[PDB]
Amino acid sequence: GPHSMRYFETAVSRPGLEEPRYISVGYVDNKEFVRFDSDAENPRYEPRAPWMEQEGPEYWERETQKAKGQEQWFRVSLRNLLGYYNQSAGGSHTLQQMSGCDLGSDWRLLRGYLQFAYEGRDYIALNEDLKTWTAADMAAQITRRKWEQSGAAEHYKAYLEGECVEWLHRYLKNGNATLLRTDSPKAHVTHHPRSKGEVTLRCWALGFYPADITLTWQLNGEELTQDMELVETRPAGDGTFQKWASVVVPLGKEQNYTCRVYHEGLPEPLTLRWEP
Amino acid sequence: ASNEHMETM
Amino acid sequence: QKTPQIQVYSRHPPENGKPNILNCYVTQFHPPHIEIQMLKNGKKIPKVEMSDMSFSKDWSFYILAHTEFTPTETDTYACRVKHASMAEPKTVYWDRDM
Ligand code: NA
Known part of the structure; x- marks a missing residue:
């Protein structure tokens, strides 16, 4: 580099x-x-x-x-x-x-x-x-x-x-x-009920270092770049960073959505879904 | 190590 | 002049009655003079630690304001920001889901 x-x-x-x-x-x-x-x-x-x-x-x-x-x-x-x-x-x-x-x-x-x-x-x-x-x-x-x-x-x-x-x-x-x-990210998905029979799925990446990270949401393969909501990378204040990415999904169809975390500290990218 | 400006703006 | 962007959030995932740190991260602002206040029940919090001021590649400044705090109800938390770029201050509430 x-x-x-x-x-x-x-x-x-x-x-x-x-x-x-x-x-x-x-x-x-x-x-x-x-x-x-x-x-x-x-x-x-x-x-x-x-x-x-x-x-x-x-x-x-x-x-x-x-x-x-x-x-x-x-x-x-x-x-x-x-x-x-x-x-x-x-x-x-x-x-x-x-x-x-x-x-x-x-x-x-x-x-x-x-x-x-x-x-x-x-x-x-x-x-x-x-x-x-x-x-x-x-x-x-x-x-x-x-x-x-x-x-x-x-x-x-x-x-x-x-x-x-x-x-x-x-x-x-x-x-x-x-x-x-390097400090590798710990990731988890949160479920936030909304109206119209929809749910916000939020993928969190916490305690990582350095700041550079990629959060991706997918639906039965293929990225959801279009309507995905991101937050800007934030310092946690202890030297590590935080980020989340979310998608609005229909109720009952949440297991079709997958989140991926890419970070230089990882042995391989993380793959995760909402765990009910 | 830092640099030193000489002629001013 | 650049208008500040604010995010208010916690250092750790918020547990119902656990000691945590509340952050207010303000970015993309110019001039560097800014006033940041951290509120509990709409009231100012004493002993608010502020980081040193830095600026980015586009010349705009950023700063992290933080205070020791404990959720859940206990008691609604916020951050209030005044800057020359915006008429009237901006308040951003802490939302444990964001
Ligand atoms: Na920059």
């Missing part, structure tokens, strides 16, 4: 005396491993994964120093964006960033990425070539000119192709067993 590292940043301006709140979250293969929050007692990058606890004090100090600088960068950028959009003071504004790299199974760099959004809308992004910018609106063109004239794309490409790939290699070794953990 492919690997990745991403940093998700957010700076939220606040009305009043308090400076903007700055949060930086790191992800390795979509799992949170580090977090910095400027609204903490002693703001610092903290481990969020067990395998990050292997890092020496020099690592945390250097990462914390970078974040303190970035909180100031996000502060000035929010000030510049307010002026570009000719916006009123005393408001609350959001600047977000996503950046990182994707690696192949052979640890080859597939792609690097960098994108920003202002007030929830795409603002500027680095193109796949990592040399040119795609600015979404009029104000973003002011940023593009400033960044082409400073050579910003060269500095991001150097990080995305270099340090990003190097640190991801190092994180992948340090936490191979942790990342490869």
